[PDB]
Write an enzyme that holds these catalytic residues in place. Structure first.
Site, PDB file in Angstrom:
ATOM      1  N   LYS D  12      26.816 -39.001   6.326  1.00  0.00           N
ATOM      2  CA  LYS D  12      25.829 -39.297   5.293  1.00  0.00           C
ATOM      3  C   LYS D  12      26.473 -39.318   3.915  1.00  0.00           C
ATOM      4  O   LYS D  12      27.232 -38.420   3.586  1.00  0.00           O
ATOM      5  CB  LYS D  12      24.738 -38.253   5.335  1.00  0.00           C
ATOM      6  CG  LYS D  12      23.762 -38.357   6.469  1.00  0.00           C
ATOM      7  CD  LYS D  12      22.653 -39.299   6.188  1.00  0.00           C
ATOM      8  CE  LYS D  12      21.388 -38.715   5.591  1.00  0.00           C
ATOM      9  NZ  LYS D  12      21.560 -38.112   4.241  1.00  0.00           N
ATOM     10  N   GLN D  47      21.233 -37.546  15.203  1.00  0.00           N
ATOM     11  CA  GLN D  47      20.257 -37.941  14.179  1.00  0.00           C
ATOM     12  C   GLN D  47      20.418 -39.417  13.956  1.00  0.00           C
ATOM     13  O   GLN D  47      21.472 -40.000  14.188  1.00  0.00           O
ATOM     14  CB  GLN D  47      20.429 -37.126  12.911  1.00  0.00           C
ATOM     15  CG  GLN D  47      19.971 -35.687  12.999  1.00  0.00           C
ATOM     16  CD  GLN D  47      18.805 -35.223  12.159  1.00  0.00           C
ATOM     17  OE1 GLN D  47      17.720 -35.809  12.184  1.00  0.00           O
ATOM     18  NE2 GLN D  47      18.992 -34.083  11.500  1.00  0.00           N
ATOM     19  N   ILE D  48      19.364 -40.050  13.493  1.00  0.00           N
ATOM     20  CA  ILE D  48      19.295 -41.508  13.242  1.00  0.00           C
ATOM     21  C   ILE D  48      19.083 -41.749  11.748  1.00  0.00           C
ATOM     22  O   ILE D  48      18.241 -41.068  11.087  1.00  0.00           O
ATOM     23  CB  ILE D  48      18.243 -42.170  14.109  1.00  0.00           C
ATOM     24  CG1 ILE D  48      16.862 -41.573  13.925  1.00  0.00           C
ATOM     25  CG2 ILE D  48      18.672 -42.212  15.534  1.00  0.00           C
ATOM     26  CD1 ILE D  48      15.767 -42.371  14.624  1.00  0.00           C
ATOM     27  N   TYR D  49      19.795 -42.729  11.252  1.00  0.00           N
ATOM     28  CA  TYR D  49      19.772 -43.060   9.825  1.00  0.00           C
ATOM     29  C   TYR D  49      19.918 -44.554   9.592  1.00  0.00           C
ATOM     30  O   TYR D  49      20.623 -45.231  10.336  1.00  0.00           O
ATOM     31  CB  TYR D  49      20.888 -42.378   9.038  1.00  0.00           C
ATOM     32  CG  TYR D  49      20.920 -40.868   9.173  1.00  0.00           C
ATOM     33  CD1 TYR D  49      20.026 -40.049   8.560  1.00  0.00           C
ATOM     34  CD2 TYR D  49      21.844 -40.315  10.020  1.00  0.00           C
ATOM     35  CE1 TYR D  49      20.097 -38.670   8.727  1.00  0.00           C
ATOM     36  CE2 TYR D  49      21.948 -38.954  10.194  1.00  0.00           C
ATOM     37  CZ  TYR D  49      21.064 -38.134   9.542  1.00  0.00           C
ATOM     38  OH  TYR D  49      21.219 -36.740   9.712  1.00  0.00           O
TER      39      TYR D  49
END
Lengths: 58, 58, 58, 58
Positions: D12, D47-49
């Site tokens: 991220k 996790q997805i982003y």
């Protein structure tokens, strides 16, 4: 009452891994005692789990 | 102090949609006032959001 | 090969509820066949689950 | 076409931290190019982003 408190260091017992500090709590019929855990590896990222999924370390 | 209480009906203001009841709370440096919301459409499913992302309805 | 395709309508079999369309896929050692599902109730919100957790409806 | 491929190491850019390998992909109207990322610190947790949230490292 509550198994864990704010700031306790916990990890997932099994399955997908997660480890860090208790930063909150939730309560649903499916999960009547749940905790929010902030990753100690990934600051700011939080996952929520049932108490049965977590164990205190440290 | 807290913007919402347990059982308040809330929704996401913008972006990805979510709507249901407040079922918990969390506090991190990135999100010093966060809430857990159980979907009213998908019982048992819970997502966590910062207070700024949510609004009370109703 | 893949159990579901893009756009299939699926739901969680048990536990926390979720229902909507297949919008992606993932593969890990713990979940070698996983799917991303966009809620039909909460547009834009996506959750990821192992194939064993999902069933096609419709 | 795709910005990242399976197995790319990404993190991220800002906000909540996450770092690890690309293990899948998703596509919604809100996130037309999204990725699933398995944590390198927390094996099995994904996790997805949106692509705009991620950068490749390495």
């Amino acid at each position: 009452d509550a198994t864990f408190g704010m700031g306790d260091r916990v990890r997932k017992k099994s399955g997908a891994a997660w480890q860090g500090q208790i930063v909150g709590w939730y309560c649903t019929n499916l999960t009547p005692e749940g905790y929010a855990v902030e990753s100690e590896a990934h600051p700011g990222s939080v996952q929520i789990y049932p108490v049965a999924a977590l164990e205190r370390i440290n």
